[PDB]
């Protein structure tokens, strides 16, 4: 699935 770094930048 999507990278965890995507969920971090998502909000950030």
Curated annotation (Swiss-Prot):
Keywords: Amidation, Amphibian defense peptide, Neuropeptide, Secreted. Expressed by the skin glands. The modification Methionine amide is found at residue 12. Transmembrane segments: none annotated. GO terms for biological process: defense response; neuropeptide signaling pathway. Belongs to the tachykinin family. This is Kassinin.
């Amino acid at each position: 699935d999507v990278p965890k770094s995507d969920q971090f930048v998502g909000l950030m």
